[PDB]
Design a protein around this ligand. Structure first.
Ligand SMILES: *Cc1c(COP(=O)(O)O)cnc(C)c1O
Ligand SMILES: *Cc1c(COP(=O)(O)O)cnc(C)c1O
Lengths: 396, 396
């Protein structure tokens, strides 16, 4: 019987999508998007992945089931990407990877594993964080507490407020860290802050969980991983949920991984069998296409070279738009100090607009941003930059 | 901390897989498989789906996210397949479909929806049923009770034992029905038994849940759906979890659907928004490739004609192997009455071997079957039929 079923709440970002595509004005700019767009305003499929897909089409002979944890080459390629090509974690075989449906699937199977096999009751998420983090852990019945993160005034990482909230977390509490390109703020810990965090975590008995969705968008693939690697040098156990949605432009093929690391090569196998049991009772075994694309790009040097170039071009495009935004706002002129945008990493940052200012942006100018003032920098193109900055200067 | 984590139990069928592929004898036959195989012993990718994939490769311009419920054409094609091309359910818009990662994903999001939004506490599953049914519902915290189904003696549907167990189910309990090709037995209700079941269900207040994984393997696409359609004529609400894994040979692309039907066009939307919320907290939005393949085959008549022929050829191959098995056992000769195999539908049936007899099959003859005596008829080829029947006659 379903007549007393309460409609689910209006989706905190998709509402803007539907609202946007009902405006009769092409001067309208949607900076609320969440996905990368190139200078043309389009989300292309990469050249390297169309090459990989022609290859798969020429060479696949069966669509028979992958094992629960997916394609093995995909697994070894992702823990080399994560941990570095000769890491002790990999040589001692203390990491196991399950291929999952995107980074969100990786977080739900991590959550289900934890809820069914360990005694964790709370996951600490930054304030702010990606909003679907609360939903994911709560559906497995983990409670979500949040730690201080953002300084709204200097638009930076309030590190002392952050370590001071974390002293409320007990041993065996899970603390979620964004690997790089913190969503929504774009502020990430410096390597020195990652190390003190790696060290305080070990002392206090935090189980670290990295949400690593943007490898390659802050600085480069290896550099973006130095934070996770600092925890991994120091921790016997950790979980990283990574996603290939954004750095391979493979969003809708759902390709991600859930890597479990344990003290040794044998407790990780014992724990991984239950992670596998958690996957079997959810979607059974993972979608092969997008993970086969990633595995064949990364293991083929000609293809990986091309991918790498397509990714530093996406990274550079975003860094150019953060730069063009800050001084185009300084040509259109307002009491501002939007330069903090040049310090933030990846596609998102809080613009510092009030909810009323984003409201007259949507309403009076057709500039759509998320009510928190979060803007997706990749929705800026050299051509739409000047109408955007005008609209913004006119509401400040 | 993971050192007290108990290893998950040895997988009830995959153990045979690993055991099989460690035999030095190519006379070895694995009838434990679960996937379809053709006369060559191979699980090919269909011609229609390689054609659909060349088309997608030529024509996709983005991998941007599908909406939570997936591609809309895939949704309308599956509820026409399920309900018939002009069904009142479709014209009154009382059905909504979410594209899911396989039929197992469709069952976990049905389970999560139910556990979070309704007051169901128990799901009735046949005894026997597909073993991952218990796991799926239990991970959402629904308890699984089982109803009588199989008569081990006459190898048939013990219908009176079945309606007599079901009288233990209260109103608002969920009762799971296999749409056709009951796994593991291959015995399905006749249309007359579906109708009395449709009628008793409505009286008693059962929420019916169809697990519909084998459309097209018993009789034809339309005929295989007449059981579900009889419930759907009579019910205001029902859920069907369907899978395209087997009838499209798309196993590892994870393509399935979860269809929710409610009294009207507006309570189904209200309920569907929460089903959507249950998807967002699990894998976010579904894998596009395999569902794009199904949607383009089914909406293109030249491609659908080809698919249809490839599916009646898979159906016919299985019906020929059930027939060749029964009289090859009657040429090799033993006190048998294996003719019940000719009455069962789809790829599986219980052979009626004891667990000790399947054990000396694996051990002494290299014939691998599941310990319950379940055999996958599609693992029989005209060439391996005679060694198989010999091994079997020699253990009876
Ligand atoms: C995009 C994102 C994810 C995962 O996305 P998928 O589409 O599920 O791969 C996880 N965490 C954060 C912070 C993200 O921004
Ligand atoms: C195969 C099967 C499913 C679903 O399989 P997926 O691979 O997840 O599509 C569901 N129920 C039964 C009875 C099955 O045999």
């Amino acid at each position: 019987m379903f007549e007393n079923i309460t409609a689910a709440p209006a989706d905190p970002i998709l509402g803007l999508a539907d609202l946007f595509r009902a405006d009769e004005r092409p001067g309208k700019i949607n900076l609320g998007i969440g996905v990368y767009k190139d200078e043309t305003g389009k989300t292309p499929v990469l050249t390297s992945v169309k090459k990989a897909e022609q290859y798969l089409l020429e060479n696949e002979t069966t669509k028979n089931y992958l094992g629960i944890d997916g394609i093995p080459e995909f697994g070894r390629c992702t823990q080399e990407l994560l941990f570095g090509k000769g890491s002790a974690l990999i040589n001692d075989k203390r990491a196991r990877t399950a291929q999952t449906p995107g980074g969100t699937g990786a977080l739900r199977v991590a959550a289900d594993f934890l809820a069914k096999n360990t005694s964790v009751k709370r996951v600490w998420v930054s304030n702010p964080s990606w909003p679907n983090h609360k939903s994911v852990f709560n559906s497995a019945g983990l409670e979500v507490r949040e730690y201080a993160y953002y300084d709204a005034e200097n638009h930076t990482l309030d590190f002392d407020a952050l370590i001071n909230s974390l002293n409320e977390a007990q041993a065996g509490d899970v603390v979620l860290f964004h690997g790089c390109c913190h969503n929504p703020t774009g502020i990430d810990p410096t390597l020195e802050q990652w190390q003190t965090l790696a060290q305080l975590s070990v002392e206090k008995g935090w189980l670290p969980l990295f949400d690593f969705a943007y490898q390659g968008f802050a600085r480069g693939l290896e550099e973006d991983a130095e934070g996770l690697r600092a925890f991994a040098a120091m921790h016997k156990e950790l979980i990283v949920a990574s996603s290939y949605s954004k750095n391979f432009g493979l969003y809708n093929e759902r390709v991600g991984a859930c890597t479990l690391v344990a003290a040794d090569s044998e407790t990780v196998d014992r724990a991984f069998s239950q992670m596998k049991a958690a996957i079997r009772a959810n979607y059974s075994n993972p979608p092969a296409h997008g993970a086969s694309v990633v595995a064949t790009i990364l293991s083929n040097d000609a293809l990986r070279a091309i991918w790498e170039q397509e990714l530093t071009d996406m990274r550079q495009r975003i860094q150019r738009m953060r730069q063009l935004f800050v001084n185009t706002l300084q040509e259109k002129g307002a009491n501002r100090d939007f330069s903090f945008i040049i310090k933030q990493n990846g596609m998102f940052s809080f613009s510092g607009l009030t909810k009323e200012q984003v409201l007259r942006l949507r309403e009076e100018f057709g500039v759509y941003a998320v009510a928190s003032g979060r803007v997706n920098v990749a929705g800026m193109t050299p051509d739409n930059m000047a109408p955007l900055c005008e609209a913004i200067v006119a509401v400040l």
